[PDB]
Design a protein around this ligand. Sequence first.
Ligand code: HEC
Ligand code: HEC
Ligand code: HEC
Ligand code: HEC
Ligand code: HEC
Ligand code: HEC
Ligand code: HEC
Ligand code: HEC
Ligand code: HEC
Ligand code: HEC
Ligand code: HEC
Ligand code: HEC
Ligand code: HEC
Ligand code: HEC
Ligand SMILES: [K+]
Lengths: 531, 531, 86, 86
Amino acid sequence: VEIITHWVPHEVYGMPGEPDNSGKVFFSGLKAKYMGYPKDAQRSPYPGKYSKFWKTLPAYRYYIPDYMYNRDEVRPSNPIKGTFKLEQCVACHSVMTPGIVRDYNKSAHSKAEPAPTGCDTCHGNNHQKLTMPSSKACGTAECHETQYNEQGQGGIGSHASCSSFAQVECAWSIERPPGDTAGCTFCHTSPEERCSTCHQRHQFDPAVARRSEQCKTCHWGKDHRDWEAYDIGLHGTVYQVNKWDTEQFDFSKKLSDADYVGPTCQYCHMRGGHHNVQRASIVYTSMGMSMADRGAPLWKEKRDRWVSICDDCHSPRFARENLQAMDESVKDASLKYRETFKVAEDLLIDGVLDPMPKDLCPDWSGQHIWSLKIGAYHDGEAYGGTTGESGEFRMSNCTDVERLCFESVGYFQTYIYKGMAHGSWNDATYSDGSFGMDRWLVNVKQNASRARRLAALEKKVGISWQPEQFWKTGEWLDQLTGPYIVKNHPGKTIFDLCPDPGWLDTHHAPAEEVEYIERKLKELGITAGSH
Amino acid sequence: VEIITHWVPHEVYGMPGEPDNSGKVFFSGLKAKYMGYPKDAQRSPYPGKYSKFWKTLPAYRYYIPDYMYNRDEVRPSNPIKGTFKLEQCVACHSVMTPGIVRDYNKSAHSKAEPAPTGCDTCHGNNHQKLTMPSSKACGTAECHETQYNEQGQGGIGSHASCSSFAQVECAWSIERPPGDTAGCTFCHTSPEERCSTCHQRHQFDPAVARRSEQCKTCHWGKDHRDWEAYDIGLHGTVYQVNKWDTEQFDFSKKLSDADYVGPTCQYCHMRGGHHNVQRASIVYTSMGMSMADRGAPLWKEKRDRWVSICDDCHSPRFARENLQAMDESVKDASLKYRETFKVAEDLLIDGVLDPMPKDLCPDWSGQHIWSLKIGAYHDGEAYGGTTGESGEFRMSNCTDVERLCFESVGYFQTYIYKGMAHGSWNDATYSDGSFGMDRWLVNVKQNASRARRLAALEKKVGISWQPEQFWKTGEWLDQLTGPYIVKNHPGKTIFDLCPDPGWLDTHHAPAEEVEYIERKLKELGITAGSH
Amino acid sequence: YDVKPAKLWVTAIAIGTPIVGAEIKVGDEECTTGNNGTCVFELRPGTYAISVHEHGGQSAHKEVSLEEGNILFVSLDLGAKARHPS
Amino acid sequence: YDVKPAKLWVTAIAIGTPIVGAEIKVGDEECTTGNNGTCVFELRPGTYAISVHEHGGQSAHKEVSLEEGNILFVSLDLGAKARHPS
Ligand code: HEC
Ligand code: HEC
Ligand code: HEC
Ligand code: HEC
Ligand code: HEC
Ligand code: HEC
Ligand code: HEC
Ligand code: HEC
Ligand code: HEC
Ligand code: HEC
Ligand code: HEC
Ligand code: HEC
Ligand code: HEC
Ligand code: HEC
Ligand SMILES: [K+]
């Protein structure tokens, strides 16, 4: 495989210094002058705390539509003028966008009486004042308030907050050029903002929404192998073998009446058809990066509920003990990471980390706080930042040791939790699970050893190592928020520049959750934690 | 993505030094006090040679049930008392565990005459003396002795020995806390011990068992991409495209009458419905990590048999030559690894390996033998251990060079064998195949170069490098068998402490296998090998 | 003959997030927003003044002319000052 | 009326692996295990003593009282001493 520099007409070859947005071919993407995203392109600013630093693309308009499409100031132009009846929407679009009309005609919305839920009902009559319907539009009292409210019951890390918190206040997305993290906007906003999730537009078929694969489009990959774990496990094996056999899986049945041979994502997480997908969750553990013994007496009632779900096709004992095994795997995983972290932390404390945070490019905030610093556990001069303030947890713009630590807990550890939870034994072991963390521990130790050996040699020979320029600056690094803040707002951080209240300021844990924990801690006599 | 330390009530935040089994959330899994597995929990010891060092979880009771469930000393408690008729099992469980009864009612067992094979037939009548039916229970002369005996014909690395040898004497499982390798128990024991494998309980449908996907649940992932190779190959393409077309794939037919358009795992490995899945195998090559030219005249008759299977849908020549290509890929792969190993071996012999085995944590045995040492090929002071004794082959608790060597032969090389065997061209090349080994060879060479450059600098400057403490000890390392043996049984190894005969002591190669090899070696005039 | 009334959706936003408990006045009609931050009004043809008020002291205004059988979604953002804890 | 017999499963093991050749006697009926390592007995209701004797001079003893139409699986682990090569 070569970087092919032939056949394609030369007239279209980009030469050094030429704009990257010219449309010319730059071999291996080299030598081009970075022009950045089109800031003249008609679009919407992102909502939320960090609106000012949120670089947006036109495409984003669809993804948080109430703010980014539906406001008069933002709504995009449309070449078709006039206000139309439903008949007219259908007739025109049946040819202009055939698939949409094909889908609509299949939908229950079209057949509804006395009046159908038509294109105009969801989009408006005036073609110059069209709107994109958010979850709020679907969730009106007259329509589907039930499902909206159900979903909205979710806490942090649920379908209720995956846009407003996770995405709108996403560090990396804000930090980087848009497009670097474009996929994050397209993935994160959907569950909260668009109800075409799971049951696709414009058919809105609950039968297709009941299929496991619906979840895979988001619940897969590097930091949550939810689909992969389920799919390859015996539940997923049973599923793939039987899913088109109507005698084994009847998707026409409502989830309350679901009598499948094996479970679906929906069978477990959307028990009874409840739209709060987090309803049965025990405790939020930051994607499984944070650790908890879910089998502990503290969570007895919550674990019991899970056993009630498995009860459908297993003895309580079998399920109880299998989930206990998961708990053990989770605990043993964090044992490994603690050892891994110690190696990394020691490099920082001994100041032999290559390089130290102060010699890296400033983080998204415009600070030189240690990547791995957790404000609740770490405090000191070496870590940086104010008391209680965390670092920008990342796999980018850091040392190999920092990166491998991130990968160990942020990727491999999650494969153990999700793997064991969904019955994928290999995901929890060989397939980048337990043995993934093992491999990375070795990698961290080796990197620590090398860095310490160099530091020792340089001391004795009397070299004071000057960290290289590429740790500080570079073509990509220069485009980040960090350097911009340091240069243009010298004394301040992004938090200073964005003083508005965040999601966490306005959204708290439900009263019943605090009430349960306090009751159980008193019942068992365990000390409460700190801020 | 952050380590989120907010929203979740503080009362449940774990603070440094607190037990990990409290049920409190430890951010990134840090600062918790490791309490280890519940040793007070009612369970069974593991069977076999290393019983004493085999740490077990309650859940394991199901997985080797004859020893771990069915003995009076071990059988778990049950809240339901009485001895019952079959009618009673069905009626009660139809509500208590609905799915099991749904499955049972579909099964042929329920319909059997003059008497059905009921819950009581497999589990017993006394609810206080319930048993879990192993392969021995199914394989009684009165029932399915045929399938039991067929499966039992398998040698090492078959479904006949995957529990008794591979798992019961699994180095890593014994070495580590349980849960670290919990998935290994759940995966390995099944084929040998539980006949609910392939044809799921409680339906026991041979039709579902005939589907390729059945094998995927175990035959996937880092060290055997059996499913992945098949699935993505043209056989797997044909399969996925046609599997629900009854005209192309009829799963109601017995394997003797299978007239599919394309092959299934069962079509090739379980020819004629024979339960010895290894029946057609040429020679055991340790997951394909060991190398053999299967196309050599020595194995002519065995390769010919494979051509007989491919013959069904291809010319003998086409199949012959395609499998010859596999042989060549396998040989060329080991050529690469020999170069890779040489680099690693040279670091050990020159004593510049960072660090040397003596400065690592003791292995599972309580020794400091070199990870990569193969007793049959390696002997010397530098390697460690007695003559003929191997090291603990691992990806954990070693150098990067050792780790990368393991990965090269233990992961990437297997993708070449399995890839070429199943028709996945990319698995044998780009997708971590041949080019995977290439990448790791570069990685090994670089690590060797760096280690040698540091050693040279330290000699000239007069530093004698003290290997760091983290190679010897650490939060996870301390929990292993190695340190325990060194501390508590100073003079001895695990083999001393577990003197009982192992699997290899009581199980030998079949007479016909030795007879064939001896006949062929004489026929061709090749020298026999050594111990 | 039945004059088909216009349907007007009014969504109250505070830089992205829905405002709960805001009062929307359209003509003579009043609606106090739920979790949606959205009120749906069925109105006879004519020109109307939409006003969104919230207890923080922030307001948004828009005048809208509705014909027979019109459907219009209106999205009004009241700024970051309209965002209140819990 | 038919006095439905009791079915007795006797599994001989040696820390895991089934003991081949081992013989099991209960009452008057004498069974000797194959590769399966299990003997299925059908007995008239009553009290019966189970004895598992081997060529390698190792035995395990137990006793069961079976009612009408009982199914009981018995697992007896004789130990590592009841394990010989091939
Ligand atoms: C993408 C559009 C998604 C689809 C389709 C589904 N889910 Fe989801 N889910 C998604 C995100 C972005 C998030 C949370 C992000 C965050 O704010 O942290 C979730 C959350 C969940 C959870 C809760 C996880 C937790 O840590 O508490 C569950 C249990 C969950 N999702 C399950 C789930 C199921 C079963 C789905 C199919 C029906 C499904 N999700 C669809 C993104 C998307
Ligand atoms: C009809 C056969 C289609 C063609 C041709 C293309 N797409 Fe599509 N797309 C289609 C459906 C039915 C869906 C699912 C809708 C849902 O509610 O999820 C999609 C989905 C997308 C998406 C993601 C959904 C979203 O974020 O809105 C994108 C980004 C998308 N489609 C874009 C897209 C592009 C760029 C295409 C041309 C190359 C294209 N689609 C083709 C149906 C069809
Ligand atoms: C995937 C995680 C989903 C998201 C996000 C939303 N919905 Fe859904 N919906 C989903 C499933 C699996 C089902 C079938 C559940 C069942 O009871 O069997 C549904 C069903 C609906 C329905 C039909 C209600 C009924 O009569 O059973 C409606 C009206 C509905 N969903 C609306 C809806 C809305 C408004 C959403 C956005 C907030 C929404 N859903 C999100 C899966 C998922
Ligand atoms: C039932 C057998 C399940 C099926 C089918 C799927 N999942 Fe699940 N999931 C299940 C359990 C018991 C757990 C552990 C919950 C606990 O804390 O004890 C999970 C975990 C998840 C999570 C994490 C939720 C959290 O609180 O952190 C997610 C996001 C998740 N599962 C998603 C998911 C998806 C997308 C699935 C379909 C492919 C799926 N799960 C299958 C039980 C079951
Ligand atoms: C023989 C053909 C069986 C009949 C008849 C029934 N079951 Fe079974 N069951 C069988 C096997 C091989 C296994 C696996 C045992 C193991 O060691 O893992 C089981 C397992 C169970 C379990 C526990 C496992 C679980 O899924 O929770 C239960 C609770 C169980 N079986 C109950 C059960 C009932 C109620 C039956 C009558 C309808 C029944 N089984 C029939 C084999 C056989
Ligand atoms: C998990 C429960 C498995 C299922 C389902 C299937 N197989 Fe398997 N297989 C499994 C293990 C753990 C092992 C051997 C482990 C060991 O002791 O080394 C095997 C072995 C085989 C082999 C022989 C491999 C060899 O090196 O000689 C073959 C050819 C094989 N398995 C094929 C196979 C097929 C075709 C299956 C589906 C019908 C299948 N296996 C199911 C684990 C599991
Ligand atoms: C019915 C719809 C089920 C629900 C709900 C859950 N499981 Fe399941 N599980 C089910 C089947 C039909 C099977 C296949 C049985 C077989 O013979 O292989 C399984 C399999 C498992 C397994 C693996 C099989 C084994 O080792 O015994 C495990 C570990 C398992 N199931 C556990 C489990 C848990 C913990 C569940 C709740 C979260 C659960 N299952 C849900 C059917 C169904
Ligand atoms: C997967 C690798 C399997 C394991 C492990 C076991 N069996 Fe199986 N079995 C399997 C298949 C693919 C088939 C269909 C084969 C065919 O001939 O078409 C079967 C079939 C059976 C049958 C039916 C026998 C018949 O009339 O053809 C029985 C009674 C049976 N199997 C029993 C059985 C027992 C007792 C097992 C444990 C030792 C066992 N099987 C393991 C696939 C697999
Ligand atoms: C026929 C075309 C096959 C299908 C379908 C599958 N496999 Fe296979 N497998 C096949 C061959 C010719 C070989 C090489 C055997 C040799 O030594 O020449 C293999 C290899 C394996 C092995 C390794 C066996 C060994 O002796 O080392 C395993 C474990 C294996 N295959 C499993 C397997 C599974 C699980 C499949 C379904 C997904 C599968 N194979 C498909 C031929 C064919
Ligand atoms: C033209 C439309 C064809 C007819 C009619 C038949 N076959 Fe064919 N065959 C065809 C192609 C394009 C190929 C691939 C050739 C290549 O270079 O790879 C083949 C291949 C074969 C082979 C060898 C490949 C194999 O799978 O073993 C054989 C043995 C073969 N064809 C035999 C064959 C027979 C017996 C036919 C009559 C029933 C027949 N072919 C028809 C194209 C065409
Ligand atoms: C009344 C209800 C019954 C009757 C008449 C039978 N069983 Fe059971 N069984 C029942 C319950 C509530 C449970 C779950 C107990 C718990 O874990 O809390 C069970 C469990 C089983 C099991 C699983 C044992 C285990 O978990 O290890 C088996 C294998 C089982 N039951 C079989 C069984 C048979 C064969 C019966 C007829 C003779 C039978 N049961 C009767 C509830 C009830
Ligand atoms: C008798 C049997 C026949 C007849 C009448 C024909 N073919 Fe063949 N053919 C036959 C065999 C046994 C084999 C396999 C030979 C071997 O590899 O050991 C073949 C092979 C082919 C092939 C494949 C050639 C190759 O491997 O490269 C083809 C393409 C083929 N046969 C085609 C073919 C055609 C077109 C025939 C009619 C004119 C024909 N065969 C007749 C057996 C027999
Ligand atoms: C594996 C390699 C390989 C084995 C070594 C050989 C010789 C090739 C050759 C190429 C070349 C050359 C190209 C052109 C691109 C370049 O940059 O040099 C490469 C393309 C490629 C694609 C096209 C994808 C696209 O253009 O978007 C595809 C589909 C490839 C897949 C095969 C593959 C089958 C599974 C295997 C094996 C190889 N390639 Fe390739 N190839 N290839 N490739
Ligand atoms: C990619 C990233 C991303 C782009 C950069 C942005 C900004 C996000 C935001 C988050 C945050 C924040 C979370 C919460 C966890 C934490 O530790 O900070 C994270 C969660 C996440 C999940 C939930 C899994 C769970 O909780 O078990 C899911 C399903 C995610 C998937 C999307 C994804 C769609 C394919 C892409 C792209 C990203 N995420 Fe994320 N997100 N996310 N994420
Ligand atoms: K043939």
